Design a binder for these strands. Structure first.
Ligand SMILES: Nc1ncnc2c1ncn2[C@H]1C[C@H](O)[C@@H](COP(=O)(O)OP(=O)(O)OP(=O)(O)O)O1
Ligand SMILES: [Mg+2]
Length: 903
DNA sequence: CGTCTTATGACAGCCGCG
DNA sequence: GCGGCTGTCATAAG
């Protein structure tokens, strides 16, 4: 098989690479790399290398990288361009790996660990690292074993060995419920002393050296902590054993309050799972404690223990060890579901970068573009510095705030990348400019055709159609990968809906979940095998369909991000090809394209419909249009449709067979009008929304820009067995909104759109009646702990100081000197509750770390002094009032004037 | 070392207001 | 002692 890299580092004049040879064995190299850079030269200077604009360059080979850096600064001291790849690590991979990398993941040692550390005086700081590590669980993907390092003896207790037999037992038999799947994969190692455990851990680290280090929060806790603890006991030299190349870096970043350390292990790609989640998950969570995320991702209970963690090792060492194990395992199950490491490797090897550079899309693209550029023997520009500058973005329509009964929506397939292609927008494909008319004339088609030689954008730019661009090129490859995985995702989602109808009446049977690829549309035979199955068999099938869909999701949405991020890279001063003429060519074209097609969509329907000058497009954002479908439904009445599904099928058939080709006609005309390389503007039918047949439900409603809800029956060819609410922007969708309140506002919106005004008031009346009974956490608001320092007037609120910030200050006074209480960390989320007048906390509100409960020290005061009236109005009724008004509804009851007829 | 603009709402403080 | 406005902040939609 082909050879592929594991890690790579630059150290001085030596490149340190770990890799896999033709055999699948893992080797290392120390390479004394001889990089090449480039400089322009006169025309008559024969050469194979040219810059991207067409200009001759001579290659300058160098003895070593220091000398190549020495040259880059001198070229600037003189002030001439130093073209080429300034980052020599990427150049070396590009040299060593002159092909498309296919990689054997089973040969890649992904390690996954967590440590435990008892502390009676509050959170154990890794900076200091002043407490014993009393447990570590290190899972190794190659061995497929969890290595448990256990400390029987410590200043904080002498404990007996952990019993696997006990750990296996269920928590109702008095055990730990450590999963079946992992009981035969634990290798357990008790230790008398710390020094011993550590040394063994280090030796173990040497023979099973992690290529990808991951885990929950390891980057800010685990890694730093083991490093410093080992460093303080055995000296810094021993600590460096953690790096296979024996080189490390300490990035101390003293927050305005206390210390904080970041350790770089050369030779290892640390991918902390917390960061991979934030980037790739497309969620904004109330809290990021593993405990919370496990719940959310896996529907799986909180690892339970009595008393505080600080004395679990002494109370119940058995539990203590088991939780450190299951903690490791959970991250493995989350990744089984989400595939973020899989993703990371894909992009990583695709771009040919260090795996941990998947976090920076600027890096990713620089390497993709360089590699692509290198094979055509072209020289890349030098990165140049730039001031930051605003530039205009997308166009959003102001919708008339109303109820909407029948709504059909349409959206462009990857707008900004398609534009990039359609127009051939790239650094080296720029043809010049042209005098631009008010954009509203290009929208209307009045303005002079800007050029009939060059491909154009309404911002005034012109592009070549002859030659093809680096960016269009590279953006197209990844787009197709996106497209493929989107295909599988959407199929899985349909297969999901087919299984959902099957369990409306499952065949009384003892059967077998079918052996099938959930990525593809269930064929007839298998659909007819489907309904003959049992609930047990069918649920397993659903579960699996769902796991496929989610996996397709990840692959799809993250590749979508990467390309959209190429666009965003164009508007970013740090990007080698940073360029605002291109960035605005994209967005301005986006604006024209969205309004242009509004006009056409509005024109065609007024035609086919009968009237003239009726606004059918009620709304649109960047690349979407939401068309009102009332008058089209009105062209057959309420009668002719048997059931709900009959008018859905209709609209779908109408969109597909009448509207779409009209759209297509419109967009290819615009393509001509703009003289673009290729027509690539596609609006796929997205949503079909309305009320269920002969019900008093409102279908949809807009409140303003970015704020609407709809009742959807079909989303992009998927015919849900249950109508699903599509809610955008409203507080139900915001992680700041209290949990129970998200659920309530949602049941409301579901009530307005499906049932009607009647149902709303009924449920509204119930909710406020029961409100005071809800769990304080479930009804707390969430915010981020930012800039506490800045607003701290020596203990009290400063000028301008925000609500949640104010809440945090009151907390910190109410926990003065108490070091057992959880402090609040900068940047992390807090729960927020308002306080009643006269409370003993001083202020009108309080805040505490989210994902956790408030410490007992204040727990019972906050619960007494809690302010429900305020909470209900600010968090539930104000929001509901917003929705209510727009929809023309009341959520309560008007002044009868017919009350005179009571009883 | 470093994706982007557009837009909403909860709040704070400012200002006018017999 | 408020409703209208502006700016800061947190957080959505694309
Ligand atoms: N995270 C982002 N960064 C930069 N630009 C974005 C981002 N999200 C969206 N955009 C811009 C460019 C998109 O093409 C345009 C419309 O976005 P959107 O419709 O969500 O997806 P898309 O049109 O790129 O693909 P698709 O509609 O197929 O999911 O808005
Ligand atoms: Mg789109």
């Amino acid at each position: 098989m082909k050879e592929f890299y594991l890690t790579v580092e630059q150290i001085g004049d030596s490149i340190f690479e770990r890799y896999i040879d033709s055999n699948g064995r893992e080797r290392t190299r120390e390479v004394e790399y001889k990089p090449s850079l480039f400089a322009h030269c006169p025309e008559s200077q024969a050469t194979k290398y040219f810059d991207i604009y067409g200009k001759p360059c001579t290659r300058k080979l160098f003895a070593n990288m220091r000398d190549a850096s020495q040259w880059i600064k001198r070229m600037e001291d003189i002030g001439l361009e130093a073209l080429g790849m300034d980052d020599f690590k990427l150049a070396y991979l590009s040299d060593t790996y002159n092909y498309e990398i296919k990689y054997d993941h089973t040969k890649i040692r992904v390690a996954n660990f967590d440590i435990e550390v008892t502390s009676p005086d509050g959170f154990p700081e890794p900076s200091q690292a002043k407490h014993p590590i009393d447990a570590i669980t290190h899972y190794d993907s190659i061995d497929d074993r969890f290595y448990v390092f256990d400390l029987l003896n410590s200043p904080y207790g002498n404990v007996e060995e952990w019993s696997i037999e006990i750990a296996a037992k269920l928590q109702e038999q008095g055990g730990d419920e450590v999963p079946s799947e992992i009981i035969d994969k634990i290798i357990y190692m008790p230790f008398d002393n710390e020094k011993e455990l550590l040394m063994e851990y280090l030796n173990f680290w040497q023979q099973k050296t992690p290529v990808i280090l991951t885990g929950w929060n390891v980057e800010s806790f685990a890694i730093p902590y083991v490093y410093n603890r080992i460093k303080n006991i055995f000296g810094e030299s021993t600590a460096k054993r953690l790096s296979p190349h024996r080189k490390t870096r300490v990035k101390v970043i003293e927050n305005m309050y206390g210390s904080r350390e970041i350790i770089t292990l050369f030779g290892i790609s640390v991918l902390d799972y917390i960061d991979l989640y934030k980037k790739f998950s497309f969620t904004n969570q109330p809290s990021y404690s593993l405990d919370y995320i496990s719940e959310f991702e896996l529907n799986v209970g909180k690892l339970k223990y009595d008393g505080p963690i600080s004395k679990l090792r002494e109370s119940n060492h058995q539990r203590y060890i088991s939780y450190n194990i299951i903690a490791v395992y959970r991250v493995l199950q989350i990744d089984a579901k989400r595939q973020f490491i899989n993703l990371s490797l894909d992009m990583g090897y695709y771009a040919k970068i260090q795996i941990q550079s998947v976090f920076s899309p600027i890096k990713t693209w620089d390497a993709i573009i360089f590699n692509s550029l290198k094979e055509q023997n072209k020289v890349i520009p030098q990165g140049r510095s730039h001031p930051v500058q605003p530039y205009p973005g997308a166009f959003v329509k102001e919708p008339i705030p109303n109820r909407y009964k029948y709504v059909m929506s349409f959206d462009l397939t990857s707008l900004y990348p398609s534009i990039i292609r359609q127009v051939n927008i790239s650094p080296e494909t720029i043809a010049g400019t042209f005098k631009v008319a008010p954009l509203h004339d290009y929208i209307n088609a009045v303005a002079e055709r800007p050029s009939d030689v060059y491909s154009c954008s309404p911002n005034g730019m012109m592009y070549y159609k002859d030659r093809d661009g680096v960016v269009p090129t590279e953006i197209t490859k990844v787009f197709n990968q996106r497209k493929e995985h989107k295909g599988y995702m959407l199929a899985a989602q349909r297969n999901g809906e087919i299984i959902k109808e099957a369990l409306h009446n499952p065949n009384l049977s003892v059967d077998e979940p079918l052996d099938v690829d959930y990525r593809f549309d269930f064929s007839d035979e298998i659909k007819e095998k489907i309904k003959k199955l049992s609930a047990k068999s069918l649920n397993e099938m659903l579960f699996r369909a769902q796991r496929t869909e989610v996996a397709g999701m990840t692959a799809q949405i993250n590749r979508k991000l990467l390309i959209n991020s190429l666009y965003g890279a164009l508007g970013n001063v740090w990007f080698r090809y940073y360029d605002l003429r291109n960035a605005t060519a994209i967005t301005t074209f986006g604006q024209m394209a969205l309004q242009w097609i509004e006009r056409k969509v509005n024109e065609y329907l007024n035609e086919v419909c009968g009237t003239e000058g009726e606004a059918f497009v009620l709304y649109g954002d960047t690349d979407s249009i939401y068309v009102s479908a009332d008058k089209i439904i009105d062209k057959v009445g309420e009668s002719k449709f048997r059931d709900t599904n009959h008018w859905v099928d209709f609209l779908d058939k109408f969109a597909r067979e009448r509207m779409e080709p009209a759209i297509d006609r419109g967009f290819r005309e615009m393509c001509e009008y703009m003289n673009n390389k290729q027509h690539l503007m596609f609006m796929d039918r997205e949503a079909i929304a309305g009320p269920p047949l002969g019900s008093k439900g409102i279908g949809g409603f807009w409140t303003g820009k970015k704020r609407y809800a709809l009742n959807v029956w079909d989303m992009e060819g998927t015919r849900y067995a249950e109508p699903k609410l599509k809610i955008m922007g409203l507080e139900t969708q915001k992680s700041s909104t209290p949990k129970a309140v998200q659920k309530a506002l949602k049941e409301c919106i579901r009530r307005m759109l499906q049932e009607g005004e009647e149902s709303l008031q009924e449920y509204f009346k119930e909710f406020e009646k029961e409100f005071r009974q809800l769990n304080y956490i479930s009804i707390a608001s969430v915010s981020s702990a930012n800039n506490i320092a800045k607003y701290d007037v020596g203990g009290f609120p400063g000028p301008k100081c925000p609500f949640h910030i104010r809440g945090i200050l009151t907390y910190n006074r109410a926990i003065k000197g108490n070091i057992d209480a959880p402090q609040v960390v900068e940047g992390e989320k807090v729960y927020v509750l308002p306080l009643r007048e006269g409370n003993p906390f001083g202020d009108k509100c309080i805040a505490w770390p989210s994902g956790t409960e408030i410490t007992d020290l204040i727990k019972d005061d906050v619960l007494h002094w809690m302010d429900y009236t305020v909470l209900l109005e600010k968090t539930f009724i104000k929001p509901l009032e917003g929705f209510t008004s727009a929809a023309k509804l009341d959520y309560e009851k008007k002044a009868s004037l017919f009350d005179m007829f009571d009883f």
